[PDB]
Amino acid sequence: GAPATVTEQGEDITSKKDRGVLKIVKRVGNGEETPMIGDKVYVHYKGKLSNGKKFDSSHDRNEPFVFSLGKGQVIKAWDIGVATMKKGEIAHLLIKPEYAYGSAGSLPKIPSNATLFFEIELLDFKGE
Numbered sequence: 320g321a322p323a324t325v326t327e328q329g330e331d332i333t334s335k336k337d338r339g340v341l342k343i344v345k346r347v348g349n350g351e352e353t354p355m356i357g358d359k360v361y362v363h364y365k366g367k368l369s370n371g372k373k374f375d376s377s378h379d380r381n382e383p384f385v386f387s388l389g390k391g392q393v394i395k396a397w398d399i400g401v402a403t404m405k406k407g408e409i410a411h412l413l414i415k416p417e418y419a420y421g422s423a424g425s426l427p428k429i430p431s432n433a434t435l436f437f438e439i440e441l442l443d444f445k446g447e
């Protein structure tokens with residue numbers, strides 16, 4: 320399902336065009352403005368390893384996930400991906416290890432050389 324559809328006609332949003340981060344918009348946002356680097360960004364997400372063994376949701380807590388875009392608080396794929404989103408957008412991203420946790424991984428939660436999948440809802444973003 321959702322990951323497979325992202326592989327299939329998945330929009331490659333890397334600069335190098337190496338298919339490291341593929342995207343589909345599933346619910347369209349409003350406003351023309353995507354976040355610039357530095358913006359304080361508020362999201363809900365669901366995430367999983369493609370190996371199917373771990374799943375993580377912002378809802379597993381009772382709060383949005385907040386982070387500063389482009390300030391290395393998240394994996395490179397998030398900085399690239401959420402910079403393409405509009406307020407109120409829901410998107411799916413499929414991510415190769417290079418744009419996530421690489422060969423080292425982040426044990427034991429993230430194995431070596433893992434591919435990741437996320438659904439992200441962009442709630443809001445303000446300047447700082």
Ligand SMILES: COc1cc2cc(OC)c1OCCCOC/C=C/COC(=O)[C@@H]1CCCCN1C(=O)[C@H]2C1CCCCC1
Pocket residue numbers: 364366367368373374375384392393394397425428429435
């Ligand atoms: C690698 O560590 C984790 C990764 C994710 C969630 C974690 O805790 C809930 C988590 O545990 C340690 C606490 C880390 O919290 C700060 C940030 C971690 C970096 O996370 C990320 O960049 C991405 C994007 C933003 C949401 C979290 N996230 C993760 O990679 C998640 C994992 C969790 C395992 C399934 C795939 C998603």
